[PDB]
Amino acid sequence: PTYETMFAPEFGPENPFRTQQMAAPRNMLSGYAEPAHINDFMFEQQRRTFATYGYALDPSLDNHQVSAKYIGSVEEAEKNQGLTVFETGQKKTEKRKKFKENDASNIDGFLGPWAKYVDEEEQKELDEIT
Amino acid sequence: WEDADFPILCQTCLGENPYIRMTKEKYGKECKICARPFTVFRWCPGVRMRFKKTEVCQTCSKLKNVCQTCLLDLEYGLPIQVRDAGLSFKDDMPKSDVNKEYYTQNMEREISNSDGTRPVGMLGKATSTSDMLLKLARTTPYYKRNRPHICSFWVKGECKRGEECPYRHEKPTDPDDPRYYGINDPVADKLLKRASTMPRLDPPEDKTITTLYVGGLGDTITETDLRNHFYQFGEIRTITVVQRQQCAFIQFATRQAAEVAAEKSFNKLIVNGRRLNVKWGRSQAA
Amino acid sequence: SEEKLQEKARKWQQLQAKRYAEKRKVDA
RNA sequence: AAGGUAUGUAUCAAGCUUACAAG
RNA sequence: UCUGGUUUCUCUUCAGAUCGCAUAAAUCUUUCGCCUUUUACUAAAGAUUUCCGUGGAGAGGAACAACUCU
Ligand SMILES: [Mg+2]
Ligand SMILES: [Zn+2]
Ligand SMILES: [Zn+2]
Ligand SMILES: [Zn+2]
Numbered sequence: 231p232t233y234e235t236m237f238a239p240e241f242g243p244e245n246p247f248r249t250q251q252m253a254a255p256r257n258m259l260s261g262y263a264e265p266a267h268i269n270d271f272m273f274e275q276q277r278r279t280f281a282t283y284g285y286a287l288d289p290s291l292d293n294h295q296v297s298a299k300y301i302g303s304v305e306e307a308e309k310n311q312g313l314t315v316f317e318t319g320q321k322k323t324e325k326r327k328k329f330k331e332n333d334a335s336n337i338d339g340f341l342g343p344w345a346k347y348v349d350e351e352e353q354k355e356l357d358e359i360t
Numbered sequence: 361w362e363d364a365d366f367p368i369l370c371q372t373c374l375g376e377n378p379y380i381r382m383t384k385e386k387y388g389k390e391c392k393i394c395a396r397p398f399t400v401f402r403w404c405p406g407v408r409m410r411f412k413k414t415e416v417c418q419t420c421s422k423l424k425n426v427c428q429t430c431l432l433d434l435e436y437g438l439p440i441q442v443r444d445a446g447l448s449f450k451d452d453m454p455k456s457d458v459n460k461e462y463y464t465q466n467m468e469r470e471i472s473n474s475d476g477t478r479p480v481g482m483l484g485k486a487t488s489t490s491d492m493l494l495k496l497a498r499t500t501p502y503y504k505r506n507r508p509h510i511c512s513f514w515v516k517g518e519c520k521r522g523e524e525c526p527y528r529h530e531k532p533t534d535p536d537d538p539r540y541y542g543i544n545d546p547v548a549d550k551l552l553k554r555a556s557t558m559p560r561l562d563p564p565e566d567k568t569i570t571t572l573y574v575g576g577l578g579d580t581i582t583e584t585d586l587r588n589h590f591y592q593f594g595e596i597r598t599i600t601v602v603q604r605q606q607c608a609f610i611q612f613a614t615r616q617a618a619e620v621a622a623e624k625s626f627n628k629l630i631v632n633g634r635r636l637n638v639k640w641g642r643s644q645a646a
Numbered sequence: 647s648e649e650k651l652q653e654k655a656r657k658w659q660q661l662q663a664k665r666y667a668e669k670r671k672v673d674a
Numbered sequence: 675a676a677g678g679u680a681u682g683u684a685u686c687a688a689g690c691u692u693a694c695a696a697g
Numbered sequence: 698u699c700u701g702g703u704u705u706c707u708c709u710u711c712a713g714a715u716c717g718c719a720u721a722a723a724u725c726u727u728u729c730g731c732c733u734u735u736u737a738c739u740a741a742a743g744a745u746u747u748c749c750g751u752g753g754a755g756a757g758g759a760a761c762a763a764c765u766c767u
Contacts, residue, residue, distance in 0.1 A: 281407055
């Protein structure tokens with residue numbers, strides 16, 4: 231196999247008779263679906279990074295042929311300067327103090343991890359809808 | 361009766377995460393049209409969102425080029441009869457239980473075993489598109505599709521879960537405006553929305569505006585392009601290509617054909633890849 | 647460039663302490 | 675145990691079924 | 698002076714052995730016996746399975762494993 235064979239472009243006016251979606255490559259009726267063998271842990275880490283903080287690195291192979299950015303909402307990534315969820319962060323801010331009873335001696339007073347937190351007109355419309 | 365490998369799934373149903381984890385059964389639920397046992401898939405789109413499993417089989421999605429769970433067009437993100445009226449052909453399918461129903465689904469599956477790539481009959485008329493549907497193809501979709509549906513016991517004010525009620529609260533739905541072809545309730549309002557856009561007012565005279573200030577020629581429109589786009593309309597009385605402003609002046613003899621040009625070009629005549637510039641001419645000896 | 651010259655070491659020898667840590671080569 | 679007290683229609687709820695797609 | 702491991706849990710094929718110091722049910726093919734026909738049956742042979750169990754083997758831990766066989 232040679233690079234010049236597969237990298238050779240296609241002659242033509244690109245056939246703009248079709249729509250954008252039907253001219254686009256596929257194997258499955260919705261996009262070219264193909265297997266993969268990513269590391270489990272870094273998949274889960276950057277997944278949880280996006281799921282919490284709304285940014286992650288982008289997965290690709292041949293989008294621009296160079297892709298090294300972040301995605302989602304961009305500016306909050308550099309607000310935290312690219313930290314993760316498994317890191318003891320630079321500050322301990324907006325924490326929320328629970329009250330603990332971990333003796334197992336008092337009864338109806340022991341709340342271990344089950345501790346409920348220290349924090350603890352529409353019905354006219356609801357009756358007229360029902 | 362049916363296995364699968366990966367679902368159809370338009371983009372608004374996947375959610376905002378490029379990294380989603382999704383689970384599969386082997387014969388899951390049944391299709392909600394044809395009772396066929398597909399392979400139900402489930403995932404989490406977003407962190408404030410319900411799971412939105414999988415609603416119809418791969419066969420009943422390949423019939424009408426429809427996504428897998430929200431039942432919208434895979435090319436646009438539109439309902440079904442919007443597409444079929446906007447392509448003026450229905451691609452019929454029966455209504456009853458057997459009467460030609462599972463018969464035609466079985467046979468159209470049997471003649472869809474080869475490709476697995478494109479819809480069965482829509483492939484010929486999904487090319488001649490992008491004129492009447494592209495004006496309403498809402499990109500950057502709203503994710504209110506994925507939000508979890510409204511709980512009871514907030515409706516009755518009883519919900520002991522407090523904050524951790526996963527579903528929703530304080531969204532009372534309204535009992536005035538909420539299958540597969542027709543008829544669907546918000547679609548009538550959406551076709552009234554497309555039939556009743558915001559044009560320029562039609563001025564009180566008798567069709568004197570056969571001239572029009574169409575411009576933005578740049579280097580895209582040429583003289584023979586616009587006068588062969590108007591020669592199918594009909595005959596000119598005077599053309600000019602005034603290139604100081606990159607504009608073109610055409611009229612018609614007895615206005616009517618150029619009338620549909622006024623209907624074709626309210627920032628709408630899209631040839632040569634440009635949103636053309638249109639405002640109203642004189643027709644006033646000025 | 648300034649503290650990233652050791653913050654990248656923090657992230658790397660943070661991540662690699664879970665990349666291969668828990669004997670990936672709990673079951674019963 | 676079956677082999678005998680027929681079955682075949684037309685209106686009227688619980689049993690069972692999903693708690694979904696949705697401007 | 699150096700060498701240095703029994704339990705318990707999961708998988709991994711091989712079983713040729715009273716795999717089990719005892720012993721179920723089924724299918725098929727024939728002869729019985731009751732029988733009116735069919736399943737429930739009878740009680741012998743042949744050949745097959747299923748099932749309740751076991752034997753030796755690779756791996757992963759954890760359980761005092763550091764007491765010490767060596
Ligand atoms: Mg008889
Ligand atoms: Zn179906
Ligand atoms: Zn969808
Ligand atoms: Zn609630």
